[PDB]
Curated annotation (Swiss-Prot):
It comes from the Eukaryota. This is ICA512-cleaved cytosolic fragment. The chain holds residues 691 to 977 of 979 of the full protein. It comes from Homo sapiens. It is found in: Nucleus. ICA512-CCF translocated to the nucleus promotes expression of insulin and other granule-related genes; the function implicates binding to and regulating activity of STAT5B probably by preventing its dephosphorylation and potentially by inducing its sumoylation by recruiting PIAS4. Enhances pancreatic beta-cell proliferation by converging with signaling by STAT5B and STAT3. ICA512-CCF located in the cytoplasm regulates dynamics and exocytosis of insulin secretory granules (SGs) by dimerizing with ICA512-TMF and displacing SNTB2 thus enhancing SGs mobility and exocytosis. Residues 1-287 are cytoplasmic. There is a cross-link at K64 (Glycyl lysine isopeptide (Lys-Gly) (interchain with G-Cter in SUMO)). Residues 19-279 form the Tyrosine-protein phosphatase domain.
Length: 287
């Protein structure tokens, strides 16, 4: 029953001492292993937006060195899996820097990715969160990846959708890609409703995802909002398959085994649980 599981989450949400104790336990959570030595190496420091938010050595996206303009494998990006391969995978990554824009697109190309989730505005009260990695109009060429803005649909003030035609100009292969851009999510504190994000999520998940390809999810540090989104999606997707592991804190633990520090605040943790419960509610009210 969803009525049973929804009753559980609502009790969980009202229980602020349980919340505080889960979060405390999560602040002390440490993966094994947890080394980020390659990311911290001297060549790579300039390629990270935030020094505290890095991929683990055991779980990082490796660019194909021969295809890289700088001949490096490094991008601040982490694969996030389940053990089952039939389940939805992600790449959690930082918002591209000006000098990592060609790295980002090489990652998009080699991963197979047809969906990008962007969770930040480019600038948040005067603080730059992300560099623009897409053309505002027409086409832009980043190394060998020609990105063509086909369509922009503003659905509301909370979110819009860009559709792109992507060409590898070397091989002449083509791909369609959709960027889902959420505009209204602050880096500190949460959105006052979970509604618009959940509507946004329904549009993301109905999009053509590719043949077993990751969704790329990013914000600024690729940890705070990125993690909170991936947590909500992961919990809800598991529920839909009727998976028996229904524990949000343990699910967050599974995400932090793969990229460190995801979900940055207790507010984001509590928002995630509120969003999961609002979606379950919504599904039932439609039945």
């Amino acid at each position: 029953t969803g009525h049973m599981i929804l009753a559980y989450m609502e009790d969980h949400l009202r229980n602020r001492d349980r919340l505080a104790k889960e979060w405390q336990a999560l602040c002390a959570y440490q993966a094994e292993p947890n080394t980020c030595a390659t990311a911290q190496g001297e060549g790579n420091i300039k390629k990270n937006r935030h020094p505290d938010f890095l991929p683990y050595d055991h779980a990082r996206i490796k660019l194909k060195v021969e295809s890289s303009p700088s001949r490096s494998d490094y991008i601040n990006a982490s694969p996030i899996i389940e053990h089952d391969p039939r389940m939805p995978a992600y790449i959690a990554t930082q918002g591209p820097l000006s000098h990592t824009i060609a790295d980002f697109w090489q990652m998009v190309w080699e991963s197979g990715c047809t969906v990008i989730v962007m969770l930040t505005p480019l600038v948040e009260d005067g603080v730059k969160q992300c560099d623009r990695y897409w053309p505002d109009e027409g086409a832009s060429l980043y190394h060998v990846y020609e990105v063509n803005l086909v369509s922009e649909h503003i659905w509301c003030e909370d979110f819009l959708v860009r559709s792109f035609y992507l060409k590898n100009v070397q091989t002449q292969e083509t791909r369609t890609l959709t960027q889902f851009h959420f505009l209204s999510w602050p880096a500190e504190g949460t959105p006052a409703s979970t509604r618009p994000l959940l509507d946004f999520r329904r549009k993301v998940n109905k999009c053509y995802r590719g043949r077993s390809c990751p969704i790329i999810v990013h914000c600024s540090d690729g940890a705070g909002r990125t993690g909170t989104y991936i947590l909500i999606d992961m919990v809800l997707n598991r529920m839909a398959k009727g998976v028996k592991e229904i524990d949000i804190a343990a699910t967050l633990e599974h995400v932090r085994d793969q990229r460190p520090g995801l979900v940055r605040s207790k507010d984001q943790f509590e928002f995630a649980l509120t969003a999961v419960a609002e979606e379950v509610n919504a599904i039932l009210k439609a039945l």
